[PDB]
């Protein structure tokens, strides 16, 4: 336990002169109790990796001996708090110390020990029945929205000996006891899980459902899959919190865990105020979205060890919450900054530069992170189901896709929502490139789309083909001059314009159109494509049959229809009923057919 | 606190470059300070870097010249470097180490603090809201700087970024005069300039300018000349930031700190790393350079529960005008926005030549707004940007084709471009244009055009502002 | 207009120089004041040296502190010529305490050739066997160190406290 | 001429200022002198010897 | 054929950067000239 603390070749120091202890074990240094992790062992001594500053550490300092590795406390009260990369209850320490800066020797438990919770036992299990790891024996009403379930720790089982009745108890108190063959072990409300292992699952089920998004753009063109993995380019000023908030408010998930690197207090306070402002009326009542969030973030300053540990803390928390039979979306923000963090930790290892300083195990870390996702059948008796999605926001270095990390991530994702800053400069939102965006999970979604819509996929293929054909005709008419082209392709031009101006834009500042239901989206697309097909057929047939039908004849006979199409978006489903909207759209389609018949 | 005596030494194992090594040390500690005595009586300080058993390593600031193997008294303070902070620093000039160099007396310390100091808790961070006027029209009118908006200025060899920095310093001020004349008497602005890696002529020019403006009551200057020892070049930023944090979070002052020629800081960090004998990095810079520059820059912003703020304005040079050089790249991933100076415009004899086209600012969306200022700041900037862009384009097209092919609007565009480059950018060294006067001159330039061509300004303000 | 600009520039530079010199004069006066106070402290301490009754206890404490510091098999103590029996008695008292404290056998000598200068008010310098490590635990060094450590409190006493400083931490 | 008279008067006023603050500082010292000296000498006298906290048998 | 011939060196990086920038400026200039010529063509072939 001698503190043989050396000097530094960076922001980290090492030590020696102790007894035998396993590596990747967390011990404390000095009277300040700094975070330290064994990395290297030689002989009867072991190097350590201290995270805090290395100032003032002297020889002969104590080194406390422990028996556990880096781990995360898991239990009730996590929802609504603000944590760093090593799980420090930052609001609570600011409350306790009344300090301005980060205090040292932070010996505060991640959760409080003076807050009582209402306990409901399972009212089915009796003392003496055998319980396995992952079975729920209790629930907590953490808040009106989410009920923080409690499960037996994995890698444990035995025959129960005590069951506690409902009551108001704290974390330290004992509620469940049991008895393995030979010994017996009590169980409190808190479990601890090492970070660098994956909690088990019974089996992994294919993702077979769409992840809803607020706007019809990127929800009908390039949908995501619930529990999937996706990449979204994003930069300063483009607007990245738009999708964050959209997934927080209008989506079928159940919790949001936002994890980044080098974050600002702007986003923290913004989400804090969006909790009571950006609410959701689940049952007609607004509620703080704090209850549906657990923020984690690190700001430059933080020693690179914690900055790199944040991502694993986040995925561990997300997995602990998915095991409770819920849905999750983990915003893996600051991905390029995370690659920079990887480079920075490898800086103090003298490792061979694979490519511009990337450690050799860069690919290993990519694989170990991005793969822990998907939908999984939970491990327990009541047979829950839940999934974790990951959304790694790509942050290219000034639009250059030369990073090996960017390409490596772009080979794992199947969905891409490209962003063009110039389209945002054109006052068009959402700013989607419309050509580089793709979605290869279309096959997984074909089965969902058939069973309930039976028409959307033809419309989605027609929309993509029309989008390419409009660019082809744009090339034709920049060569010609936009004054000499037949009517046959002018109808394609006009429909493409109408889809662009109405269906491929959704104003988040419009009071009632901040969320387009997907059945509504299908209705609008069906009506517009029906108009397109009818006009195209009419002009093609009359091009030689009789009475050549042109842009002007059609336009004049359907100024009413054109304005009605342009005014479809002003429906307000919030107040007007769904039946009203669908009936009115069907009537509008009928009117289109009647007008085209009255033409001929 | 500590009342134990001090332990000296005369053993010295070996010496190598800017390092000294001595053993038989009794319970050393990291980053301990040491006072050395030479055979001739000269005294040179140093800092500890490596410790192992009894062996120890210090680093002499003043340089290893003529150190004797036996006749050297190496002494141990028993502590780490501590800054004698005090409010009455203001109006003084110090060297790198903090020793006064303006013929004055030793500092009378109000307190002591860690030279590294402490970093700010992210929960106690307040989003910047209001803007600090610089006295330059090219920046204020088109590009707002909120409180704590860490914006760097990218420059290179031969460019007059030094004069621009001096102008910003001597013309610094607030926009609290928007309320009333009598109420503006409550001024709470201070400056802490930190010349580092600066040649003699520049350092003295800064001193002369600061004395000339007569605002030395609110200017604390740290000079580190080129010929000074290289190890002291990495200590001065910490001292400046610690004094700024003191004056901000203890006396509730608003502070604008400036650091100049950070490329010299990068060179110093490179050299100390090379002496440390560590694995190089990309372009030989230390691998942990990003972390170091992070713990330097970030000490800035606002904190809840305090009436005070800090604002960091770094300045750095670009080797061979290489925008992809590591220093500006790693500075990009911390700071916010980018200011540029155009070589051609310097060649056209236009002072100060700030290129508005590549300039950016992320906080400009909310740093300006209604109530805090007039309603006509952001829209005016966008309109002027569009007008200048199309004016340069029309100048290019005139060069391509000829004057005979220009329309009336093209003539207006060319006249606007010439008048803009003659009036707005050209400000002269001493013209202190306020924000209001800057918007007024922008209106004067926009008067060339008919209101119809001004499509980026909404009609709601054109019916109020164009007929004047 | 050229001459007017020149005249006003001369006005401003002159006034700025006067302000600077005034402030520097004030600061120099304060520094001289504190220096005089420290010199008085030195003189009063030198007066207090004369009282043998408590000087013996102080020397005992100083020697014990030095012995506790150096922790080596060989030791040498150095003291003024005129206080030799006092340091002898203090060391003979100090040795058993050191043995009972550290659980180690050490040998302590007194040198008889080299001595502290005459101007030394008092104190003790302790070397090791090979004279390569020392702790000049002398009275003036203690005064200087203790004064420099407590300097902000001295300023607080001699000039009150600055109201504009609202918070301490 | 007006400016020269102004510099003369302003220098006289500034010297008057320096005189009054110097007198105030002298009075401030003379008010409280013995307390700090007694405290300082008491701190010098105190010894409280002990061993380095990290020594072991 | 596929690539310019020059030894890899930092001065060569700056030189090829200058060559590319000159090519881009000439590109833009001749596009503007072409636009002027097309406008002239259209207004002389009007009626």
From Swiss-Prot, chain A:
Result when mutating residue 395 to A:
Reduces the interaction with CRYAB and MTOR
Q: Which UniProt keywords apply?
A: ATP-binding, Cytoplasm, Cytoplasmic vesicle, Hydrogen ion transport, Ion transport, Lysosome, Membrane, Nucleotide-binding, Phosphoprotein, Translocase, Transport
Broad enzyme group: translocase
User: Where on the tree of life does the source sit, at the highest rank?
Assistant: Eukaryota
- What are the BP-aspect GO terms? ATP metabolic process; cellular response to increased oxygen levels; intracellular iron ion homeostasis; synaptic vesicle lumen acidification
Q: Which residues carry this modification: Phosphoserine?
A: 368
Give the record's membrane topology. Peripheral membrane protein
Is Thylakoid given among the entry's keywords?
A: no
* Entry keyword annotation includes Cell division: no
* Consequence when changing residue 368 to A: Significant loss in AMPK-mediated phosphorylation
Name the residues that bind ATP: 234-241
Q: Where in the cell is it found?
A: Cytoplasm; Cytoplasm, Cytosol; Cytoplasmic vesicle, Secretory vesicle; Cytoplasmic vesicle, Clathrin-coated vesicle membrane
- What is the catalytic activity of this protein? ATP + H2O + 4 H(+)(in) = ADP + phosphate + 5 H(+)(out)
Family note: Belongs to the ATPase alpha/beta chains family.
Q: What does this protein do?
A: Catalytic subunit of the V1 complex of vacuolar(H+)-ATPase (V-ATPase), a multisubunit enzyme composed of a peripheral complex (V1) that hydrolyzes ATP and a membrane integral complex (V0) that translocates protons. V-ATPase is responsible for acidifying and maintaining the pH of intracellular compartments and in some cell types, is targeted to the plasma membrane, where it is responsible for acidifying the extracellular environment.
What is the official name of this protein in its record? V-type proton ATPase catalytic subunit A
Gene assigned in the entry: Atp6v1a
From Swiss-Prot, chain B:
UniProt keyword Transmembrane present? no
What's the protein name? V-type proton ATPase subunit B, brain isoform
Give the record's membrane topology: Peripheral membrane protein
Q: Which domain of life is it from?
A: Eukaryota
Q: Which family does it belong to?
A: Belongs to the ATPase alpha/beta chains family.
Ranges that cross the membrane: none
Listed InterPro entries:
ATP-synt_VA_C, ATPase_a/bsu_AS, ATPase_F1/V1/A1_a/bsu_N, ATPase_F1/V1/A1_a/bsu_nucl-bd, ATPase_V1-cplx_bsu, P-loop_NTPase, V-ATPase_su_B/beta
Q: What happens when the gene is disrupted?
A: Morpholino knockdown in the whole cochlea, especially in hair cells and spiral ganglion neurons causes a dose-dependent hearing loss.
Q: Name one GO cellular component term.
A: clathrin-coated vesicle membrane
Keywords of the record, alphabetical order, are: ATP-binding, Cell membrane, Cytoplasm, Cytoplasmic vesicle, Hydrogen ion transport, Ion transport, Membrane, Nucleotide-binding, Synapse, Transport
> Which Pfam families does this one have?
ATP-synt_ab, ATP-synt_ab_N, ATP-synt_VA_C
Q: Where in the cell is it found?
A: Apical cell membrane; Melanosome; Cytoplasm; Cytoplasmic vesicle, Secretory vesicle, Synaptic vesicle membrane
UniProt keyword Ion transport present: yes
Q: In which tissues is it expressed?
A: Kidney; found in early distal nephron, encompassing thick ascending limbs and distal convoluted tubules and in the alpha-intercalated cells of the cortical collecting ducts (at protein level). Expressed in epididymal clear cells (at protein level). Mainly expressed in the organ of Corti and spiral ganglion neurons, in both the early postnatal cochlea (P2) and the adult cochlea (P30).
- Biological process GO terms, please? ATP metabolic process; synaptic vesicle lumen acidification
As one GO molecular function, the record gives:
proton-transporting ATPase activity, rotational mechanism
User: So where does ATP get bound?
Assistant: 362
Curated annotation (Swiss-Prot), chain D:
**What subcellular locations does the record give?**
Melanosome; Cytoplasmic vesicle, Clathrin-coated vesicle membrane
Origin: domain of life: Eukaryota
**Compositional bias ranges of the Polar residues kind:** 1-10, 19-30
Q: Which family does it belong to?
A: Belongs to the V-ATPase G subunit family.
Q: What does this protein do?
A: Subunit of the V1 complex of vacuolar(H+)-ATPase (V-ATPase), a multisubunit enzyme composed of a peripheral complex (V1) that hydrolyzes ATP and a membrane integral complex (V0) that translocates protons. V-ATPase is responsible for acidifying and maintaining the pH of intracellular compartments and in some cell types, is targeted to the plasma membrane, where it is responsible for acidifying the extracellular environment.
Q: How does it assemble?
A: V-ATPase is a heteromultimeric enzyme made up of two complexes: the ATP-hydrolytic V1 complex and the proton translocation V0 complex. The V1 complex consists of three catalytic AB heterodimers that form a heterohexamer, three peripheral stalks each consisting of EG heterodimers, one central rotor including subunits D and F, and the regulatory subunits C and H. The proton translocation complex V0 consists of the proton transport subunit a, a ring of proteolipid subunits c9c'', rotary subunit d, subunits e and f, and the accessory subunits ATP6AP1/Ac45 and ATP6AP2/PRR.
The protein's name is V-type proton ATPase subunit G 2
* The organism of origin for this protein: Mus musculus
User: What is the phylogenetic placement of the source species in the record?
Assistant: Eukaryota, Metazoa, Chordata, Craniata, Vertebrata
From Swiss-Prot, chain E:
Superkingdom of the source species: Eukaryota
Where in or outside the cell?
A: Membrane; Cytoplasmic vesicle, Clathrin-coated vesicle membrane; Cytoplasm, Cytoskeleton, Microtubule organizing center, Centrosome; Cell projection, Cilium
Family recorded in the similarity comment: Belongs to the V-ATPase D subunit family.
Q: What does the record note on quaternary structure? A: V-ATPase is a heteromultimeric enzyme made up of two complexes: the ATP-hydrolytic V1 complex and the proton translocation V0 complex. The V1 complex consists of three catalytic AB heterodimers that form a heterohexamer, three peripheral stalks each consisting of EG heterodimers, one central rotor including subunits D and F, and the regulatory subunits C and H. The proton translocation complex V0 consists of the proton transport subunit a, a ring of proteolipid subunits c9c'', rotary subunit d, subunits e and f, and the accessory subunits ATP6AP1/Ac45 and ATP6AP2/PRR. Interacts with SNX10.
Name the UniProt record assigns to this protein: V-type proton ATPase subunit D
> Whose protein is this, by species?
Mus musculus (Mouse)
> Span of the full-length protein shown?
4 to 50 of 247
């Amino acid at each position: 336990t001698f503190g043989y603390v050396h000097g530094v070749s960076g922001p980290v120091v090492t030590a020696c002169d102790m007894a035998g202890a396993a590596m990747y074990e967390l011990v404390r240094v000095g009277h300040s109790e700094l975070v330290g992790e064994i990395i290297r062992l030689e002989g009867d001594m072991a190097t350590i990796q201290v995270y805090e500053e290395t100032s003032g550490v002297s020889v002969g300092d104590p080194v406390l001996r422990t028996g556990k590795p880096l781990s995360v406390e898991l239990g009730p009260g996590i929802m609504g708090a603000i944590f760093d990369g090593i799980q420090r209850p930052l609001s609570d320490i600011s409350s306790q110390t009344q300090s301005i800066y980060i205090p040292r020797g932070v010996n505060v438990s991640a959760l409080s020990r003076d807050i009582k919770w209402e306990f409901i036992p399972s009212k089915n299990l009796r003392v003496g029945s055998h319980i396995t790891g992952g079975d729920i024996y209790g629930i907590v009403n953490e808040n009106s929205l989410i009920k923080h379930k409690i499960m037996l720790p994995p890698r444990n089982r035995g025959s129960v000996t005590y069951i506690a009745p409902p009551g108001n108890y704290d974390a330290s108190d004992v509620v469940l006891e049991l008895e393995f063959e030979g010994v017996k072990e009590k169980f409190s409300m808190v479990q601890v899980w090492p970070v660098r292992q994956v909690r088990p699952v019974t089996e992994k089920l294919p993702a077979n459902h769409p992840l809803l998004t607020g706007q019809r753009v990127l929800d009908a063109l390039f949908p995501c899959v619930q529990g999937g993995t996706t990449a979204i380019p994003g930069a300063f000023g483009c607007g990245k919190t738009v999708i964050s908030q959209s997934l927080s408010k209008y989506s079928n998930s159940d919790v949001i865990i936002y994890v980044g690197c080098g974050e600002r207090g702007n986003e923290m306070s913004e989400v804090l105020r969006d909790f009571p402002e950006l609410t959701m009326e689940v049952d007609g009542k607004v509620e703080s979205i704090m209850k549906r969030t657990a923020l984690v973030a690190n700001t430059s300053n933080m020693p690179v060890a914690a900055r790199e540990a944040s991502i694993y803390t986040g995925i561990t928390l997300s997995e602990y919450f998915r095991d409770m039979g819920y849905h999750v979306s983990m915003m893996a923000d600051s991905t390029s900054r995370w690659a920079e963090a990887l480079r920075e930790i490898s800086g103090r290892l003298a490792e061979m530069p694979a490519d511009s300083g990337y450690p050799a195990y860069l690919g290993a870390r990519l694989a170990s992170f991005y793969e822990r996702a998907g939908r999984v059948k939970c491990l327990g008796n009541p047979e829950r189901e839940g999934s974790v999605s990951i959304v790694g926001a790509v942050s290219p270095p000034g639009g250059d896709f030369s990073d090996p990390v960017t390409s490596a991530t772009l080979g794992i994702v199947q969905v891409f929502w490209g962003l063009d800053k110039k389209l945002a400069q054109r006052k068009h939102f959402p700013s989607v490139n419309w050509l580089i965006s793709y979605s290869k999970y279309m096959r997984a979604l074909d089965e969902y789309y058939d069973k309930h819509f039976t028409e959307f996929v033809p419309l989605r293929t027609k929309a993509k083909e029309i989008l390419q054909e409009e660019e082809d005709l744009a090339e034709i008419v920049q060569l010609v001059g936009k004054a000499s082209l037949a009517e046959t392709d002018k109808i394609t031009l006009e429909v493409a314009k109408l889809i662009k101006d109405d269906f491929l834009q959704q104003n988040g500042y419009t009071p009632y159109d901040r969320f387009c239901p997907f059945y509504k989206t299908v209705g609008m697309l069906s009506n517009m494509i029906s108009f397109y097909d009818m006009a195209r057929r009419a002009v093609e047939t009359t091009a030689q049959s009789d009475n050549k039908i042109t842009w002007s004849i059609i336009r004049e006979h359907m100024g009413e229809i054109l304005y009605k199409l342009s005014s479809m978006k002003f429906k307000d489903p919030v107040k007007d009923g769904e039946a009203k909207i669908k009936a009115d759209y069907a009537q509008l389609l009928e009117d289109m057919q009647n007008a085209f018949r009255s033409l001929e | 606190y500590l009342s134990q005596p001090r332990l000296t030494y005369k053993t010295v194992s070996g010496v190598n470059g800017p390092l000294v090594i001595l053993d038989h040390v009794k319970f050393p500690r990291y980053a301990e300070i040491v006072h050395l005595t030479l055979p001739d009586g000269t005294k040179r300080s140093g800092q500890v870097l490596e410790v192992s058993g009894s062996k120890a390593v210090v680093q002499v600031f003043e340089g290893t010249s003529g150190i004797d193997a036996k006749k050297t008294s190496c002494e141990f303070t028993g502590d780490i470097l501590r800054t004698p902070v005090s409010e009455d620093m203001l109006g003084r000039v110090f060297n790198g180490s903090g020793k006064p160099i303006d013929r004055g007396p030793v500092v009378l310390a109000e307190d002591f603090l860690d030279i590294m100091g402490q970093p700010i808790n992210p929960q106690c961070r307040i989003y910047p809201e209001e803007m600090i006027q610089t006295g330059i029209s090219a920046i204020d009118g088109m590009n707002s700087i909120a409180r704590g908006q860490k914006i760097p200025i990218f420059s290179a060899a031969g460019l007059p970024h030094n004069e621009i920095a001096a102008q910003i310093c001597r013309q610094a001020g607030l926009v609290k005069k928007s309320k009333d004349v009598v109420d503006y008497s409550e001024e709470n602005f201070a400056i802490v300039f930190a010349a580092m890696g600066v040649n003699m002529e520049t350092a003295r020019f800064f001193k002369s300018d600061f004395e000339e403006n007569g605002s030395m009551d609110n200017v604390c200057l740290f000079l580190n000349l080129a010929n000074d020892p290289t190890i002291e070049r990495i200590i001065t930023p910490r001292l400046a930031l610690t004094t700024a944090e003191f004056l901000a979070y203890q006396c509730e002052k608003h502070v604008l700190v400036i650091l100049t020629d950070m490329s010299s800081y990068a060179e110093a960090l490179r050299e100390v790393s090379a002496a440390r004998e560590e694995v190089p990095g990309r372009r030989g810079f230390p691998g942990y350079m990003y972390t170091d520059l992070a713990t330097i820059y970030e000490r800035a912003g606002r904190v809840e529960g305090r009436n005070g703020s800090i604002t960091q304005i770094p300045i750095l040079t670009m080797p061979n005008d290489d925008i992809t050089h590591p220093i500006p790249d790693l500075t990009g991933y911390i700071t916010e926005g980018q200011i540029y100076v155009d070589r051609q415009l310097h060649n056209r004899q236009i002072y100060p030549p700030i290129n508005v086209l590549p300039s950016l600012s992320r906080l400009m969306k909310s740093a300006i707004g209604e109530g805090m200022t007039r309603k006509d700041h952001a829209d005016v900037s966008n309109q002027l940007y569009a007008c200048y862009a199309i004016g340069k384009d029309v100048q290019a097209m005139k060069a391509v084709v000829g004057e005979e092919a220009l329309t009336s609007d093209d003539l207006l565009y060319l006249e606007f471009l010439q008048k803009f480059e003659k009036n707005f950018i050209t400000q002269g060294p001493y013209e202190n244009r306020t924000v209001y006067e800057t918007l007024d001159i922008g209106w004067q330039l926009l008067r060339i055009f008919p209101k119809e061509m001004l499509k980026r300004i909404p009609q709601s303000t054109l019916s109020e502002f164009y007929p004047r | 207009e050229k001459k007017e600009k020149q005249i006003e520039q001369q006005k401003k530079i002159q006034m700025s120089n006067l302000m600077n010199q005034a402030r520097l004069k004030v600061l120099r006066a304060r520094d001289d004041l504190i220096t005089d106070l420290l010199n008085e402290a030195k003189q009063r301490l030198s007066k207090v040296v004369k009282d043998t009754t408590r000087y013996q206890v102080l020397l005992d404490g100083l020697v014990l502190q030095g012995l506790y510091q150096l922790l080596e098999p060989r030791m040498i103590v150095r003291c003024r010529k005129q206080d030799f029996p006092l340091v002898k008695a203090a060391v003979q008292k100090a040795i058993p305490m050191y043995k009972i404290a550290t659980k180690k056998d050490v040998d302590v000598q007194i040198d008889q050739e080299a001595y502290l200068p005459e101007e030394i008010a008092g104190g003790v310098e302790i070397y090791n066997g090979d004279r390569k490590i020392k702790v000049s635990n002398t009275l003036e060094s203690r005064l200087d160190l203790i004064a420099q450590q407590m300097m902000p409190e001295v300023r607080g006493a001699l000039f009150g406290a600055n109201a504009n400083r609202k918070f301490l931490d | 001429q007006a400016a020269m008279g102004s510099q003369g008067n302003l220098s006289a006023e500034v010297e008057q200022a320096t005189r009054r603050q110097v007198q105030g500082m002298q009075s401030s010292q003379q008010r409280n002198r013995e307390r700090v000296l007694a405290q300082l000498l008491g701190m010098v006298c105190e010894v409280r010897p002990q061993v380095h906290p990290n020594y072991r048998v | 054929k596929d690539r310019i011939e020059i030894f890899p060196s930092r001065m060569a990086q700056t030189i090829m950067k200058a060559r590319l920038k000159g090519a881009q400026t000439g590109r833009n200039l001749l596009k503007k000239k072409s636009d002027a010529l097309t406008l002239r063509f259209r207004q002389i072939l009007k009626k």
